[PDB]
Design a protein around this ligand. Structure first.
Ligand SMILES: CCCCCCCCCCCCO[C@@H]1O[C@H](CO)[C@@H](O[C@H]2O[C@H](CO)[C@@H](O)[C@H](O)[C@H]2O)[C@H](O)[C@H]1O
Ligand SMILES: CCCCCCCCCCCCO[C@@H]1O[C@H](CO)[C@@H](O[C@H]2O[C@H](CO)[C@@H](O)[C@H](O)[C@H]2O)[C@H](O)[C@H]1O
Ligand SMILES: CCCCCCCCCCCCO[C@@H]1O[C@H](CO)[C@@H](O[C@H]2O[C@H](CO)[C@@H](O)[C@H](O)[C@H]2O)[C@H](O)[C@H]1O
Ligand SMILES: OC[C@H]1O[C@H](O[C@H]2[C@H](O)[C@@H](O)[C@H](OCCCCCCC3CCCCC3)O[C@@H]2CO)[C@H](O)[C@@H](O)[C@@H]1O
Ligand SMILES: OC[C@H]1O[C@@H](OCCCCCCC2CCCCC2)[C@H](O)[C@@H](O)[C@@H]1O
Ligand SMILES: [Ca+2]
Ligand SMILES: [Ca+2]
Ligand SMILES: [Cl-]
Ligand SMILES: [Cl-]
Ligand SMILES: [Cl-]
Ligand SMILES: [Cl-]
Lengths: 174, 354, 341, 240, 240
């Protein structure tokens, strides 16, 4: 039947146009454009706890603002608070500042007004302050290249360019 | 029970609804074929595989279209009898309008049996076969089940490879009443031992305590007492309307057991239950038309009224569905509410004739 | 002529009736789609779009049903038997087409742009990325999101799973109590009152982040329907010219559809007044779907803004000529050659 | 054995189509209901048949009111109806036609039904087409099968709508002979038609409806000589 | 002029309804196309009219072949058609019906249109019905109005489809008189009808079509004595 052949051809064109229109609005919705170099994760009032390869609480960073980046793996803290733990059950140190940077290699860096208290009330070392300080939470080794001030319970000193670790309380400078 | 006038009306009505139903599946079929043309040549998906997909998906179209087909079939067949003066002389010789209506119902019975048999065995198995064939042909050996997620109460499970009764690379996360993660399980391979019980080989289990202790144990085997059977897993990805009846019933039982909202699947279950009721309502509405307004009108006006009534029924179905669950009503009522409404219309139109 | 007016009278009656139905139907669905997502004003401003789409179909079905009726009760047969041919039917149809085309022209060039412009002002003034119930995936595809309830943004109970490493971030799984989603060249999600667990089921070194608020990434020309037509006539742009060509193709399609459907309405009394409903609606659907598809193709720059929607209208015009010469003496001598041979 | 109709009236679109019509048919009697075309005869016929709801009057068989009754119940009372149009069951055999109606008599056993089938086939000389489908039958055989199908319901009255319309003269004698066979069976036949000559030649009583009401009744000779009848229906010269 | 049909044939669903049917009507002659019911006369009449596409045979008015011509074209050739059913424009006045048909003749003027309208009204005695809409007219008045309408087209032949259908014998003479008025107006009238008696009374020549073919032709006495006609159509004891 010639009329029925034309009707079928018309149904072909109709189906094709409809599904072309659906595909067009799909591509308009399937426009997944890759994002730009910006903080991929953000949070406020954060407490991020980190553990060692055996399951023991290594340290705690309590900050008011945290931004995790993807390309480099640098995690920027605003006003961080770092609690170091000996075997997880004893909070030995507590190190704070206004700005911090974690790295993919687990290397922290603290900039504006650094404070560092020792929760051991009998060891003779109580408080430490400096401008900028980097510490490797894994090894606990820390570097500082700017003014340093130490306050002991009966002895206070003032120097610069310190390098130690909270692992063993090994401190070293000149 | 076997009355000549019964099977006479029946034979004319099924003849007409068969024609109507062939025509409907033909038109939906060629539309599906252009949809498959939208994405041919992907992997091994040549035009033969697309034609194969369209042919396989036919019984699901038949189930979806059987209600309206029986509306139009009854309308045309009874209109035929009507216009050749056969119904009039049937009444003028004793056969009442009540008897005509019982003839229509007696021949609605086999149609209801066929549509439930389709809903149970034919359309779901054929639909899963079309989907699987299309996916395998379309990705050249990339689709069984790779990347499966599931939930059992507060547990979240992720399986990497799923076989007939074996899982490969299981991960599982448990959460407590405080919505925090307590235990995590991983296993290279898990097998299905008995009813509602799995066995994981060389499984590593991690538990969290006091936010200072995390202890993992490399157990040779671990027993899993979940209400999540492998059948249920293999059906968490298909559309509920495509799942069989007994499958829907087992799935709503599992959903109710795992403390999950089983409304949508209950609604799909009751919609599969009420599909045959809908086709009987559709045939009585046709009889109400043939006796009522469309008594001495041309077949074209009967067919156009039937199309309008079928379209309005489909819309009412797609409306009563969600509103029954968002307003808190049993899915049974949300499923059979359109059937009731059109039944009331049919009885109203037959209230003065019958 | 007497009989021409007669046809117009009958047809315009039926036409208005059909319009009173069509408009009503849309006045239903639109007013329901609006209440789901004041309402009176927005529906009143959406009336011109209903008119744009419905005026063609209105006159189309009107003359189809009217002439069908006259063919059924044989008035057209008697008019042929006395000497009233296709000329008078086509003259009456062209007059009704001219009337409805003038209405559609005003609705397409002034009323619809001015109404959409007013709606644009009112929208400037006054005022669903992921679903619930099952495991969703973000447009990124790197995170699997599972939400329990989304009830006006109230009680979420979100679960986010990320089993793949992005560039330098480790896999993680976080669970919170409530979280929002928003879209601003990117799509983001925020979580409230939860904990995030960074690690792997086999290893034990985790990082737990207890957060009150935490954000995450999910994914990443101009309005042409509302504009003054005179300023659009010379606004050189692909999609702009596509919109202008759609507006003009509606007004030009009114008479083409009329001339096509006049020969199509012929039915014998055994057939119905409705026997050409299938084919007629199929023809209308194919035309408008192809027209809309070519419009979007111009908008994409896929095909140039210089040929535009002309070929679709041309195919409609050629078709109307074909069906209108289908009763002449040559085609009847051809068909008879086939019958006797 | 008496189907009575008393003071029937029906209106349409606020105008009265039948004002006053009365008629009676007895067992053993052939009665025609004639008159000008559209004058009221047809509507009255259908009011007896049950296709038209009466607005007034009574229809009666043996002092039983069948006015408010639907058509299938009037049949159960003893009224048969043969429509002018072809009403045979097209895709059914002659056998199954008659058997289909015998089956609606639940008091009949199967053996009784088949006995009546045989008798009705042999009676109206349609044994040889018993296997034929209804749609495969010429006009005369169709009407014979439709007669036997009607009689399978065992009626007391047979109402024939226009049994002479478009009938060849060589077939008029055969229709009359069938009418007379119904009458000698005990039925009461009520015939409505436009062919006055043939109807008056078969019927033994006639009624004439004109201008909406009965204007004459009696034997054909009586109604042929009525003045109002010749003034509105037959004319000054009417050959019989 | 002289309208003629030669060796006509037609089929419906592979069934031969008309196999060999020839007839002609000349200007000024009444011609009856008669024969058994549905044995070919009616389909032959409709092939001549144009309502049925001929399958075989030739239809010529004045040696000009109009077979393939659609209705409108063979109406401009000089063929009018008056169907059995009511063909009047219900929503138009009698004045407007006739003027609407006269408005097609472009060779006439407005004054000549008015003149021919006035003549057609006072000729068919419908000057009083002038301004009445067609939907409000009785049987004979409607027929006069539509026959005056048909004559507005200035035909040469008038094809009447069953003009004696269901007619009260009073009106029979009235339509006989209008048929012979047509004939005396210079037309050739082709009658097709089932009323053998009334047609044979009016027509001057008669063609008898039975079993698809022309079986007898000639004057009314010629066919009345034709033995085949007497044995398949009219009966031995037929009475004109
Ligand atoms: C988009 C359109 C959707 C609707 C589908 C289109 C219509 C589908 C086909 C239906 C039309 C065919 O309609 C056909 O009519 C014939 C002739 O009347 C019917 O035939 C009928 O004949 C007589 C009465 O007429 C009855 O006694 C008989 O029992 C019955 O078969 C057929 O039962 C039906 O098949
Ligand atoms: C709004 C709904 C849009 C679709 C409408 C369907 O409209 C429907 O079309 C079909 C197919 O042409 C018509 O059906 C027509 O063709 C079929 C098939 O030849 C005939 O059997 C039928 O009797 C005739 O009417 C219906 O009479 C009309 O009602
Ligand atoms: C993108 C393009 C969009 C525009 C689409 C235009 C589609 C045009 C569809 C044309 C439809 C023709 O299909 C249909 O064919 C039949 C059969 O030949 C024609 O029928 C024709 O021939 C038959 C017999 O052969 C006659 O009885 C009939 O009177 C006559 O019209 C119809 O009149 C026409 O409607
Ligand atoms: O039967 C033939 C009769 O046709 C007409 O009457 C028409 C009347 O003008 C129309 O109003 C009604 O309905 C026409 C068809 C129904 C209209 C809408 C039906 C619905 C059904 C499907 C959904 C939408 C449309 O039909 C009768 C015919 O039966 C003429 O007036 C009368 O001379 C002629 O004898
Ligand atoms: O029969 C003559 C009468 O016909 C009347 O038609 C009635 C037509 C009404 C039918 C409605 C059909 C629906 C319309 C909407 C789409 C779906 C179908 C004339 O209007 C009157 O003028 C005249 O009196
Ligand atoms: Ca016996
Ligand atoms: Ca007669
Ligand atoms: Cl009457
Ligand atoms: Cl006998
Ligand atoms: Cl008579
Ligand atoms: Cl014939």
């Amino acid at each position: 039947s010639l009329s029925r052949i034309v009707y079928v051809l018309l149904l072909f064109i109709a189906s094709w146009s409809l599904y072309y229109l659906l595909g067009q609005e799909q591509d308009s919705k399937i426009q997944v454009a890759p994002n730009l170099e910006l903080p991929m994760f953000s949070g406020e009032n954060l407490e991020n706890i980190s553990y060692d390869e055996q399951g023991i609480r290594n340290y705690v960073i309590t900050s008011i603002h945290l931004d995790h980046y993807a390309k480099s793996g640098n995690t920027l803290f605003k006003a961080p608070i770092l609690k170091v733990y000996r075997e997880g059950t004893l909070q030995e140190w507590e190190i704070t500042a206004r700005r911090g940077i974690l790295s993919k290699d687990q290397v922290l860096t603290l900039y504006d007004d650094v404070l560092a208290k020792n929760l051991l009330p009998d060891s003779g070392f109580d408080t430490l302050t400096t401008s900028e300080m980097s510490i490797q939470l894994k090894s606990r080794d820390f570097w500082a290249d700017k003014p340093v001030e130490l306050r002991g319970p009966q002895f206070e000193t003032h120097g610069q360019a310190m390098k130690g670790n909270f692992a063993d309380h090994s401190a070293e400078l000149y | 029970m076997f009355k000549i006038l019964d099977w006479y009306i029946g034979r004319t009505i099924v003849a007409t609804t068969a024609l109507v139903l062939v025509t409907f599946v033909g038109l939906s079929g060629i539309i599906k074929y252009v949809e498959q043309l939208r994405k041919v040549g992907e992997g091994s998906y040549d035009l033969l595989q697309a034609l194969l997909f369209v042919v396989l998906s036919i019984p699901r179209d038949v189930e979806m279209f059987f209600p309206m087909a029986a509306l139009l079939g009854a309308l045309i067949g009874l209109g035929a009898l009507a216009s050749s003066s056969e119904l009039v002389v049937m009444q003028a010789a004793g056969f009442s309008k009540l008897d005509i209506g019982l003839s229509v119902l007696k021949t609605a019975i086999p149609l209801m049996i066929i549509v439930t048999l389709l809903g149970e065995w034919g359309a779901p198995q054929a639909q899963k076969m079309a989907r699987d064939m299309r996916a395998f042909a379309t990705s050249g050996g990339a689709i069984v089940r790779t990347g499966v997620w599931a939930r059992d109460a507060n547990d979240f499970i992720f399986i990497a490879k799923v076989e007939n009764e074996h899982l490969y690379g299981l991960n599982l996360w448990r959460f407590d009443e405080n919505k925090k993660l307590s235990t995590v399980i991983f296993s290279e391979q898990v097998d299905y031992v008995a009813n509602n019980e799995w066995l994981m080989k060389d499984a590593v289990l991690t538990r969290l305590v006091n936010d200072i202790e995390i202890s993992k144990e490399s157990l040779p085997e671990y027993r899993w007492r979940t209400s999540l059977a492998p059948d249920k897993l293999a059906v968490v990805t298909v559309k509920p309307e495509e799942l069989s009846l007994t499958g829907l019933s087992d799935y709503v039982h599992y959903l109710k057991a795992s403390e999950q909202d089983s409304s949508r699947y209950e609604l799909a279950l009751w919609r599969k239950v009420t599909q045959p009721i809908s086709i009987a309502v559709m045939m009585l509405m046709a009889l109400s038309f043939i006796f009522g307004p469309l008594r001495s009108v041309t077949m074209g006006a009967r067919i156009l009224s039937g199309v309008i009534a079928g379209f309005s029924f489909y819309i009412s179905s797609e409306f009563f569905g969600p509103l029954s669950l968002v307003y808190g009503l049993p899915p049974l009522f949300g499923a059979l509410a359109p059937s009731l409404v059109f039944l009331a219309i049919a009885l109203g139109l037959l209230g003065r004739k019958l | 002529m007497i009989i021409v007016r007669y046809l117009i009278r009958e047809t315009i009656k039926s036409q208005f009736a059909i319009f009173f139905v069509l408009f009503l139907v849309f006045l239903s669905q639109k007013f329901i789609r609006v209440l789901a997502d004041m309402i009176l004003s927005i529906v009143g401003l959406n009336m011109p779009a209903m008119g744009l789409l419905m005026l063609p179909l209105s006159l189309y079905i009107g003359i189809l049903l009217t002439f069908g009726r006259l063919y059924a009760e044989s008035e057209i047969t008697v008019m042929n038997a006395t000497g009233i041919g296709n000329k008078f039917l086509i003259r009456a149809a062209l007059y009704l087409a001219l009337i409805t085309a003038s209405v559609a022209a005003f609705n397409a060039l002034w009323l619809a742009p001015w109404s959409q412009d007013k709606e644009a002002h009112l929208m400037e003034q006054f005022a669903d990325l992921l679903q619930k119930g099952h495991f969703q995936r973000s447009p990124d595809g790197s995170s699997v999101v599972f939400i329990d309830n989304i009830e006006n943004r109230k009680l979420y109970n979100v679960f986010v799973a990320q089993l793949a490493p992005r560039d330098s971030i480790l896999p993680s799984v976080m669970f919170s109590h409530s979280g929002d989603v928003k879209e601003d060249g990117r799509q983001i999600i925020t979580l409230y009152d939860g904990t995030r667990y960074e690690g792997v089921p086999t290893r034990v070194d985790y990082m737990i982040t207890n957060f009150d608020s935490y954000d995450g990434l999910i994914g990443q020309e101009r309005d042409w329907e509302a504009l003054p037509t005179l300023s659009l006539l010379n606004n050189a742009d692909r999609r702009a010219q596509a919109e202008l060509q759609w507006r003009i193709s509606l007004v030009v399609c009114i008479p083409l559809l009329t001339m096509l459907v006049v020969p199509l309405s012929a039915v014998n009394p055994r057939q119905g007044r409705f026997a050409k409903m299938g084919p007629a609606i199929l023809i209308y659907l194919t035309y408008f779907l192809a027209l809309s598809a070519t419009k979007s193709a111009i908008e994409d720059g896929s095909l140039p803004v210089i040929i535009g929607l002309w070929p679709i209208n041309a195919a409609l015009l050629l078709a109307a000529l074909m069906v209108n010469t289908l009763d002449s003496i040559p085609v009847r001598r051809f068909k008879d050659r086939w019958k006797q041979r | 054995a008496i189907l009575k109709a008393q003071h029937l009236a029906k209106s349409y679109k606020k105008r009265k189509v039948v004002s006053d019509v009365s008629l009676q048919v007895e067992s053993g009697q052939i009665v025609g209901l004639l008159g000008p075309n559209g004058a009221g005869k047809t509507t009255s016929f259908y009011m007896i048949v049950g296709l038209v709801a009466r607005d007034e009057g009574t229809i009666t068989i043996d002092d039983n009111d069948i006015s408010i009754l639907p058509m299938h119940s009037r049949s159960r009372m003893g009224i048969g109806y043969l429509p002018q149009e072809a009403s045979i069951f097209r895709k059914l055999s002659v056998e199954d036609n008659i058997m289909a109606v015998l089956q609606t008599r639940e008091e009949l056993t199967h053996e009784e039904r088949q006995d009546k089938l045989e008798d009705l086939l042999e009676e109206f000389h349609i044994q040889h087409i018993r296997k034929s489908a209804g749609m495969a039958l010429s006009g005369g055989e169709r009407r014979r099968v439709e007669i036997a199908r009607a009689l399978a319901a065992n009626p007391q009255f047979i109402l024939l709508d226009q049994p002479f319309a478009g009938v060849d003269p060589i077939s008029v004698i055969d229709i009359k002979k069938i009418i007379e066979h119904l009458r000698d069976r005990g039925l009461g036949v009520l015939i409505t038609d436009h062919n006055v000559r043939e109807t008056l030649d078969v019927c033994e009583k006639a009624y004439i409806v004109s201008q909406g009401r009965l204007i004459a009744e009696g034997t054909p000779q009586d109604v042929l000589n009525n003045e109002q009848v010749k003034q509105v229906y037959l004319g000054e010269q009417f050959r019989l």
